[PDB]
Amino acid sequence: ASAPDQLSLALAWNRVDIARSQIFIYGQQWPVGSLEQAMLDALVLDRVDFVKLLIENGVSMHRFLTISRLEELYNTRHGPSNTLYHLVRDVKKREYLPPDYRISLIDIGLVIEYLMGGAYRCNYTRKRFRTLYHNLFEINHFPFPFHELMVWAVLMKRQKMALFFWQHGEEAMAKALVACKLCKAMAHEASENDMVDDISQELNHNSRDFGQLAVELLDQSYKQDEQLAMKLLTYELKNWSNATCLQLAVAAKHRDFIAHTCSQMLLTDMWMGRLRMRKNSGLKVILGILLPPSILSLEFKN
Amino acid sequence: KSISNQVWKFQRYQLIMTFHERPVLPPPLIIFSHMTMIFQHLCCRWRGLKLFITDDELKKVHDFEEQCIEEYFREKDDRFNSSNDERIRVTSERVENMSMRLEEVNEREHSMKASLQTVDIRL
Amino acid sequence: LKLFITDDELKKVHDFEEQCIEEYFREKDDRFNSSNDERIRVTSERVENMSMRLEEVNEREHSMKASLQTVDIRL
Amino acid sequence: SWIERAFYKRECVHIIPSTKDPHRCCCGRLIGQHVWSISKHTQLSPTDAFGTIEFQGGGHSNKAMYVRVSFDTKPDLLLHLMTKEWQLELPKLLISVHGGLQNFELQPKLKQVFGKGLIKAAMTTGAWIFTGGVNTGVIRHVGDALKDHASKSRGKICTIGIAPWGIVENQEDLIGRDVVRPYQTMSNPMSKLTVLNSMHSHFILADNGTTGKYGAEVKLRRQLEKHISLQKINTRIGQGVPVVALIVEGGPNVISIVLEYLRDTPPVPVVVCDGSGRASDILAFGHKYSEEGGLINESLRDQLLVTIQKTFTYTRTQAQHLFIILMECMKKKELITVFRMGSEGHQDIDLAILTALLKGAN
């Protein structure tokens, strides 16, 4: 066969080294679009090693992903078992029991607000691309693809793909915190449906996984440069409900994140407002309160 | 003790944000500030670590994050490849390869010994 | 207090301290090279170089035995 | 913003000589693709393609600065761009790597040793490595070496490639004004245009007004290397930066490049390596069988002639002319350092380059 059907057999066999050496050889020919179709067939069957291979050749997710392509990924029925049908049934029963509704981006949206919780109005409820959903069902491409492939990977319980998608892409610690809260929320929701305890324990273990990664990357950013680590903790996550990294950490209740030293000094720096004393700080704010003219001797923040 | 230090450090966040939410004036005289909030709703009806950053500064913080994440994954891989377990497993498996390949060298040299002794007889 | 030592004694306490510092550094070195993990490190590095050189041995011996078969053909 | 105020470029408008093909002009572009003075009548304008290029795909995501320049730009202003607005400190070593423009492959142990030694020699001093830029042959090999560098060794390598502008695929995809541009590492085998290598850091993309052809980079790279070697090193003892010419394989033109490097003030040391193929092997054969420099005998001049006629497939007079070039090259035994696999060629590319600089500065 030619390299499309060769590669289809390779994704069938799950022996990525075979594809590494023969189907991927120096000067091998591919039809225009066969790599993208094979990439679709790879991601629907949870084939992370081959995903490494295709993305190393240059499938280039920034051009691969379209609205209908993610619509195909969220609607797959193959692969290992996932509970998205149970969750979308829960949110449609809580918002408006036949199965099989051709699961929309808007439905995935409502799942994200129910699990994430709080006032996390995600991108997938916004009326803007919903108008684009009226008007189409690189404008039809997603500007930051690996975020949406994380949220697809964490809803279909891939983990192997999740970690690989946590490799590539920007806003990493944000991705880890959202993933950790999403795993913990799916665990408690699976416990609320009286489902298997094994999948609930597994989802909780995944939540400790992404939480530990978040801690380790925060500590690493502390050791490189402290000052940019504060800015990484504070900057407005417009790609995640216009939120803040510390807000996502406390929304995920993640105990070791805030108690880490950099986060504690950021909270200390917030507590002292627009001031710069710190030294014997206790015996000075009271002097400011009782005597107003003492406010002149305080060194405010520049 | 250990859990309670962790929970206190975690609850500091809610403490700071609650006192950022609370008004300027203490409760015995807070009724003035409540009245001014009603006045703010009046002038609206008549007419905080969200540190917003400009675009070159977000460019800065993203490549800094990229540097930290690649340094993380390198760090953990080189701790794995330098920790003792990997050393032991790698050493033993290539000793397996030593044994079989030098076995091939030994039997081949047996053939060479027979050939060269016969050639010495032939000269 | 102090003891305000004489020169001969100053020279001997200094060369005593030189014996102490040479003993310190040579105890650090031979405890570092007798700790198990450094022994495992040098074992793996040598076995690395050993396999490369033995691969060379195998290939050269291949060519040599083919040449010896040709020499037997020439006699 | 200063980059547009300092650099110029020239674009081609002309009399359309079709020659071979009706669509193919003198500049190699299409018939309607328009908008030296001889038959191309090119005209001056400011530059419209400089900035950064996020290399999408190709393993690790990396960003590389690029500018478009003219062929006849003065190398001092390129150096001021290169040091000031690219934030690169002046190095202690220039490694100019030259090789065949065709794509090749050689022995895997040789290329593994070569790649590891070259990336560690680049890492241990913070060298500036001047390559051909595009993803052909030896530049593909050093790109794989830099991939190995990015996988298993800590450093950041200033690996500044100097490439033409008309040969890179998707030239319209690289039009920008201090704008981050996407790139594809996918290279179409049906198209003769070759993509840039994905493992560089800076690019000196140079246009002479033509597209699809070479020759728009050689003299500019030469005078830039000369201009950097005019600049003194920071130790201020009375010397410039040392320059080494790494040669891997190559064809007919690299012998003339070697001859330009030998007959030159100051004498640039040239390191070559055997086992890769073609011109490096005949350079190694002319170095291993040479006696007292320029005095070479007759049996081995005929052996060199028949190996030139076999490997390079020229006639007798071209083989004799290039052997005259090798004989004129090879009078200086000392500047040529031949890294041999095994033997006494210092056993490593690092010592070869470093002591080649040490005894080429002399």
Which residues have CB under 8 Å from A253's CB, separation 6+?
A184, B10
Among the partner residues A26, A29, A58, nearest to D57 by beta-carbon distance = A58
Under 8 Å between Cβ of A254 and A262: no
Q: Which residue has the tokens 């080294």?
A: A17
Alpha-carbon distance C64 to A293, whole Å? 98
Under 8 Å between Cβ of D309 and D334: no
Give A55's contacts in chain D (Cβ within 8 Å). Answer: 57
Give C71's contacts in chain B (Cβ within 8 Å). Answer: 119
Among the partner residues C54, C64, C71, nearest to B102 by beta-carbon distance = C54
Shortest Cα distance from D202 to chain B (angstroms)? 17
The set of chains that have 3 or more CB pairs under 8 A with C is B
Task: Verify cis geometry, omega within 30 degrees of 0, for the bond prior to D266.
Answer: yes
> Backbone dihedral region of D147: left (phi > 0), alpha (psi from -120 to 50 degrees) or beta?
alpha
- Mutant choice from A62, A141, A142, A164 vs D, greatest count of D C-beta within 10 A: A62
Which residues have CB under 8 Å from D308's CB, separation 6+?
D282, D314, D319, D322, D323
Neighbours of A171 (CB within 10 A): 23
Q: List the alpha helices (DSSP H) in chain C.
A: 7-32, 36-73
Chain-chain contact of B84 with C43 (C-beta, under 8 angstroms)? no
Q: Which two tokens stand for residue D154?
A: 């800590």
Q: Which two tokens stand for residue D287?
A: 């170095």
Three-class SS state of B4: helix
The angle, 0 to 180 degrees and rounded to 10, between the axes of the packed helices A197-224 and A226-234 is: 140
Alpha-carbon distance D150 to D148, whole Å? 5
Q: DSSP label at D168?
A: B
Under 8 Å between Cβ of D255 and D312: no
Chain-chain contact of C68 with B112 (C-beta, under 8 angstroms)? yes
Tell me the pairing of strands D270-273 and D62-67: unpaired
Chain D, nearest residue to B70 by Cα? D60
Under 8 Å between Cβ of A208 and A171: no
Residue B119 contacts C, CB cutoff 8 Å: yes
- Exposure string for A123-137, b = 16+ CB within 10 A, e = fewer: bbbeeebeeeeeeee
Under 8 Å between Cβ of D157 and D123: yes
Neighbours of A145 (CB within 10 A): 21
Element (H, E) at B46: helix B31-46
Under 8 Å between Cβ of D90 and D224: no
Chain-chain contact of A170 with B71 (C-beta, under 8 angstroms)? no
Dump the DSSP string for D193-261.
Answer: -BPBPTT-SEE--EE-S-SS---SSHHHHHHHHHHHHHSBPTT-SS-B--EEEEEES--SHHHHHHHHH
Give CA separation, D339 vs D131, D159, D357, in Å.
20, 22, 14
Chain-chain contact of B70 with D61 (C-beta, under 8 angstroms)? no
Alpha-carbon distance B113 to C65, whole Å? 10
Alpha-carbon distance B119 to C71, whole Å? 8
Give C55's contacts in chain B (Cβ within 8 Å). Answer: 101
Structure method: cryo-EM
Alpha-carbon distance A51 to A41, whole Å? 10
Measure the CA angle with vertex A135, ends A134 and A137; round to 5°.
65
Measured in degrees and rounded to the nearest 5, phi and psi for residue A219 equal -65, -40
Give C40's contacts in chain B (Cβ within 8 Å). Answer: 84, 87-88, 91
- Of the candidates D32, D28, D53, the residue with the CA atom closest to the CA atom of residue D214: D28
Measure the CA angle with vertex B107, ends B106 and B108; round to 5°.
90
- Of the candidates D216, D49, D60, D249, the residue with the CA atom closest to the CA atom of residue D143: D60
Cα dihedral: D220, D362, D249, D310 (round 10)? 110
Neighbours of A78 (CB within 10 A): 8
